[PDB]
């Protein structure tokens, strides 16, 4: 019933050394927790990396090493390569059960950072007929693949209504994602300003719709 924590995202460049951690909410991670490490490649491709807490599964590149640093279990990749860009999970053992961490999105820069291309669409007339008003805000061509979507109405924030998708990879190896804000035809016609606030690499890229536009 413990909570296993790992960083959410880490960025590195080819040739660099990066360390990811795994911590137990109940104290120190010892050898008795037998830390495991697995890698997730796009399209449900999982591959085991570390067993015991420092033992490698045969066949795995020699650049992945595992150990215990302080009260946490760690995973170092010496000389990261572009194909190492993936999501890494870690699990700990608590006597009779395993509990996985949240995973870490690891980005190994195989190209310069790219800001997101945002676009915000308004409810179609055909949808408005059914008393429902969906807002579609598409975000593309961003890299690293970590972004943060925020919605508003008249300047005040929204705390109910959005559902953003997990970033997918494109052909150009860049990421894309899509967020929706569902309102009723009523709530839509009772406000004038709508915005999609997209955060990437510290900076914000906000888009907007005003119901007074188009003359």
């Amino acid at each position: 019933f413990a909570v296993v924590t790992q960083e959410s995202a880490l960025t590195t460049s080819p040739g660099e050394t990066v360390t990811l951690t795994c911590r137990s909410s109940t104290g120190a991670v010892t050898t008795s927790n037998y830390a495991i490490w697995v890698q997730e490649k796009p399209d449900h491709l999982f591959s085991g990396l570390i067993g015991g807490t420092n033992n490698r599964v045969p066949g795995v590149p020699a650049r992945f090493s595992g150990s215990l640093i302080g009260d946490k279990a760690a995973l170092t990749v010496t000389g990261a390569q572009t194909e190492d860009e993936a999501i890494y999970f870690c699990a700990l053992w608590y006597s009779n059960h395993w509990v996985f961490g949240g995973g870490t999105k690891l980005t190994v820069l195989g190209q310069p950072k790219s800001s997101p291309s945002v676009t915000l669409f308004t409810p179609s007339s055909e949808e408005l007929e059914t008393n429902k008003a969906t807002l579609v805000c598409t975000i593309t061509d961003f890299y690293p693949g970590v972004v943060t979507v925020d919605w508003k109405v008249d300047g005040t924030p929204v705390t109910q209504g959005m559902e953003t998708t997990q970033p997918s990879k494109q052909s150009n190896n860049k990421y894309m994602a899509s967020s929706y804000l569902t309102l009723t035809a009523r709530a839509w016609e009772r406000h004038s300003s709508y915005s999609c606030q997209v955060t990437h690499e510290g900076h914000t890229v906000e888009k907007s719709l005003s119901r007074a536009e188009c003359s």
Partner: protein, 228 residues
């Protein structure tokens, strides 16, 4: 040549019983150190370990799922099973089975999750097969000007999953970005956007075609400009 391949139902009504099978190759549960594990990846979430069953028939379970989970092996046929009763909404995820390995090196123990199957998907929805609603995403004001213009298609409320959209522009419907499904309330929702230069629309005709084989229905929607 170690292989693992999971088998399951796909869609399920709440309350029903799930029955997964993990057929494997390149190893046997007769030999020591061998065993198989069950892990699931809830859509939009991380991993959640389910159960472990070894060669000596030692079973290990998820504490909260205990009362509903039951793992068993068939060394004879070379497959492992997993049953999960009173399945509800929280059980829609993709299920994987992985080879568990045990090593006792110099007093030190090691436990691995080496080989994994690609997975099988399960959607626990009470909903009946429903056709998709298609709405055209024409560019609103503010930014109607510019070099190129991005159009779109909102495909809404359908079941089960699997829908394919095709764009048709009279010049260069180049940048097509199809987005993954977002199961809202038993029915899905996805989007697809295409990009064309501001001189090839409304001039050239753009239409998005939608297909839902499970229902066989197909929709063609023309993208027309949004005005006052």
């Amino acid at each position: 040549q170690v292989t693992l391949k999971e088998s399951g139902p796909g869609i399920l009504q709440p309350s029903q019983t799930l029955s997964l099978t993990c057929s494997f190759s390149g190893f046997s549960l007769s030999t020591s150190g061998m065993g198989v594990g069950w892990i699931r990846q809830p859509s939009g979430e991380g991993l959640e370990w389910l159960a472990d069953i070894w060669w000596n028939d030692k079973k290990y379970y998820n504490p909260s799922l205990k009362s509903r989970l039951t793992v068993s092996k068939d060394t004879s046929s070379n497959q492992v099973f997993l049953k999960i009763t009173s399945v509800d909404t929280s059980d829609t995820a993709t299920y994987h089975c992985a080879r568990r390995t045990f090593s006792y090196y110099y007093g030190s123990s090691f436990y691995y999750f080496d080989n994994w199957g690609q997975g099988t998907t399960l959607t626990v929805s009470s909903a009946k097969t429903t056709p998709p609603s298609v709405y055209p995403l024409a560019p609103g004001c503010g930014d109607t000007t510019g070099s190129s213009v991005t159009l779109g298609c909102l495909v809404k409320g359908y079941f089960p999953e699997s829908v394919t959209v095709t764009w048709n522009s009279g010049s260069l419907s180049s940048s097509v970005h199809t987005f993954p499904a977002l199961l809202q309330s038993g029915l899905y929702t996805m989007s697809s956007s295409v990009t064309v230069p501001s001189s090839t629309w409304p001039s050239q005709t753009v239409t998005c075609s939608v297909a839902h084989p499970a229902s066989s229905t197909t929709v063609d929607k023309k993208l027309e400009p949004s005005g006052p």
